[PDB]
Structure 1
C-alpha cells in the first residue's frame, strides 16, 4: 500500500493469542480485555525497553467493542471494560510515544461475534481516524461471498485513505481464500500494508511448523510480492508463553526475521522471563528483520530433516538460517558449502560469518570453496550473517 507506512515490517504488541476473548473482569480482573490491561502494557513497553528495540504499536484485537452500535451508527467501546473509551486510551498511548492499533471485521460480525463493519466502512473509518487510531487489523469472518470480501477490503482501504490520517492497514484478505481460490497478490499489495496468509497461530510447535511449511511450499507465489510498504504476515510471535520449548522459540524469532515478517508479540509483558525478553529484543536479529532493502527470504533447500533458509540484505550481506527438524536425539551436526549460499555471490571470493542465534559468536572468514560445520538442536535454529569481503573492504 502506497501510504508511506510500514517501509520496514511493522512491530508491536497484539493481545489475541495471549488473552483472547476474556470478558470476565469479575473473576479474572488481570487478564480480561480492558482499558487497564492496555495501559499496563503501554507503561511496560516503555519501561522494559520494548519501544527502544522497535516495538511501538499497542494493538487491540477482537472483543473490545460493546454488543451494539450507538444511535449514530458508530461502534462503541464496551462500557464496563473501556469506560474512558478508545480516545483517551489512544491519547495515553501517544503520550508514551507509542501508537495504537484497533480491530474490526469486513463481514457482518467479528470472529468473536461482535458488530461487523459491512455497510459501515465509511462511518467506521472516520471513527478510527477521529480517535487517533494508527493501525487497523481488518478480519475476514462472516463474509458470505468472495466478491464482498474483495470489495469490503478495497472499500475500507480507500475509506481510511479519505480520512487523511496515516493508518497501517492489515488485511486477513488472502487467508480467507484458501485453498481453492488463488489470491491476486498484486491486487492485495495495492490496498494493504500487510496481509495474513494462513491459519491462526497458537502456542504450539505444531502451529509454527505448519506456518513455515505452508510458506516454503507456496514460496514461489508470495515471496517476491513482498517489499517496503507491503508484507506477508505469518501472524503473532508466541515467544515467552507456554507451548514452545526454548529451541522452538529461537526458531520462530530467527525465521520471522528471514521472512521479513511483521513482529507482533502476543504475550504478558508483566510476566515474561529474562531469556524471552532478551531474544525478543535481540538487536542484531531485529536488524535483519528490519533490513532497509526489504526483500523477503526463502527456503534454499530441505532434506534429511534439515532446512536451509536465506535472505538477501542491504550492503550485499546475507542472513542464513539452518533448522534441525529431527525431533529425536541431540545436537545434530550439519555441513554446507558456503558456495551454495546467496546464489553463489555471498562468499565470493570470501565472506565473514557471524552467528546470531542461539548465541552471538564471530566465526571468521570462509573462502569461496570452504565448508561450514554447525551443530543444531532438535527443533532449534542457527542464524548467521554473511558479509562479503569485497564489500567489507570498500570503506
Structure 2
C-alpha cells in the first residue's frame, strides 16, 4: 500500500493468541479483554524497553466491541470491559508514545461473532480515525462471496485513505481467498500494508513448522511481492508463552527476521522470562527483520532434515538461517561452501561471519572458496550475518 506506512515490517503487540476472546472479567479479570489489560500492557511496553526495541503498536484484536452498534449506527466498545471508550484508550496509548491498533471484519460478523463492517465501511473507517486509531486488522469471516471479499477489502482500503489519518492496513484477504482461488498478490499489495497468508498460529512447534513449510512451498508466489509498504504476514510471535522450547523460540525469531515478517508479539508482558525478553529484544535480529532494503528471504536448501534459508540485506550483507528438523538425538553438524550463500556475492572475495543465534559469536573471515561449518540443535536454528568485505 502506497500510504507511506510500513516501510519496514510493522512491530508491536497483539492480544489474540495469548488472550483470545476471554469475556469473563468477573472470574478471569487478569486475562479478560479489557481496557485495563491494554492500559497495563502499554505501561510495560514503555517501562520494559519494548518501545525502545521497536515495538510501537499496541493492538486490539477481536472481542473489543459491544453486541450491537449505537443509535448512530457506529461501532462501540463493550461498555463493561471498555467503560471509558476507545478514544480515551488511544489518548492514553499516545501519551506513552505508542500507537493503537484495532480490529474489524469484512463480512457481516467478526470471527467471534460481533458486528461486521460490510455495509458500514465508510463510517467504521471514520469512526476509527475519530477515535485516533493508528492500525486496522481487517478479518475475513462471514463473507462467503469471493466478490464481496475483494470489493470489501478494496473499499475499506480507500475508506481509510479518505479519512486523511495515517492508518496501517492489515489484511487477511489472501487467507480467505485460498478456499476459492489463488490470490492475486499484485492486487493485494496495492491495497494492503501487510497480509495474512496462512492459518492462525497457536502456541506450538507444530504450528511454526506448518507456517514455515507453507511459506517455503509457496515461496515462488509470495517472496518477491513483499517490499517496503507491503509485507507477507506469517502471524504473531508466540515467544514468551508456554508451548515452545528455547530452541523452537530461537527458530521463530530467526525465521520471522528472514521472512521480513511483521513482528506482533502475542504474550503477557507482565509475566515473561528474562530469556524470552532478551530474544524478542535482540537488536541484531530485529535489525535483520527491519532491514531497509525490505527484501524478503527464502529457502535455499532442504534435505536430510536440514533447511537453509537466506535473506539479502542492504550493503551487500546477508542473513543465513540453518534449521535442524530432526527431533531426536543431539546437535547435528552442517557444512556449506560460502560460495553457495548469497548467490555467490556474499563472501566474494571475502565475508566476515557473525553468529547471532542461538548465541552471538564472531566466527571470523571466510574467503570465497572457504567452507562454513556449524552445529544445530534439534528444532533449533543457527542465524548468521554475513558482511561482504575487501579485507
Identify whether the pair has TM-score above 0.5, normalized to the shorter chain: yes
Q: Counterparts of 1:344 and 1:104 in 2: how far apart (Å)?
A: 45
CA change 1:97–1:17 in 2 (3 A) is same
CA deviations over 1:240-273 (Å, ceiling 9, x no partner): 1011011000000000000000000000000000
Please tell me whether residue 312 in structure 1 is matched to residue 312 in structure 2.
yes
Q: Counterparts of 1:268 and 1:114 in 2: how far apart (Å)?
A: 24
Q: Counterparts of 2:28 and 2:368 in 1: how far apart (Å)?
A: 59
| Residue 148 of structure 1: aligned partner | 148
Please tell me whether residue 247 in structure 1 is matched to residue 247 in structure 2.
yes
CA change 1:179–1:367 in 2 (3 A) is farther
Superposed CA RMSD: 0.7
| Residue 269 of structure 1: aligned partner | 269
Q: Counterparts of 2:131 and 2:319 in 1: how far apart (Å)?
A: 40
Q: How far did 1:284 drift? A: 0.3
Q: What SS does the aligned partner of 2:315 have?
A: coil
Q: Counterparts of 1:294 and 1:179 in 2: how far apart (Å)?
A: 29
CA deviations over 1:191-228 (Å, ceiling 9, x no partner): 00000000000000000000000000000000000000
Q: TM-score, normalised by structure 2?
A: 0.99
Q: How far did 1:350 drift? A: 1.0
Q: Which runs of 4+ in 1 moved over 3 A?
A: none
Q: How far did 1:179 drift? A: 5.1
| Residue 187 of structure 1: aligned partner | 187
Q: What SS does the aligned partner of 1:264 have?
A: strand
Q: TM-score, normalised by structure 1?
A: 0.98
Q: How far did 1:389 drift? A: 1.1
Q: How far did 1:178 drift? A: 1.7
CA contact (8 A) 2:351 2:387 kept: yes
CA contact (8 A) 2:310 2:318 kept: yes
Q: What SS does the aligned partner of 2:390 have?
A: helix
Q: Counterparts of 2:337 and 2:42 in 1: how far apart (Å)?
A: 46
| Residue 127 of structure 1: aligned partner | 127
Q: Counterparts of 1:272 and 1:144 in 2: how far apart (Å)?
A: 39
Q: What SS does the aligned partner of 1:232 have?
A: strand
Q: How far did 1:144 drift? A: 1.8
Q: What SS does the aligned partner of 2:319 have?
A: strand
CA change 1:326–1:180 in 2 (3 A) is farther
CA contact (8 A) 2:334 2:374 kept: yes
1:75-154 alignment runs, 5 A limit: 75-154=75-154
Q: Counterparts of 2:26 and 2:349 in 1: how far apart (Å)?
A: 66
Q: Counterparts of 1:331 and 1:252 in 2: how far apart (Å)?
A: 18
Question: Unaligned stretches of 5+ in structure 2?
Answer: none
Q: Counterparts of 2:31 and 2:221 in 1: how far apart (Å)?
A: 39
Q: Counterparts of 1:96 and 1:137 in 2: how far apart (Å)?
A: 22
Q: How far did 1:180 drift? A: 4.9
Q: What SS does the aligned partner of 2:122 have?
A: helix
| Residue 376 of structure 2: aligned partner | 376
Q: How far did 1:390 drift? A: 2.9
| Residue 229 of structure 2: aligned partner | 229
Q: How far did 1:176 drift? A: 0.7
CA contact (8 A) 2:146 2:180 kept: no
Q: Counterparts of 1:274 and 1:340 in 2: how far apart (Å)?
A: 37
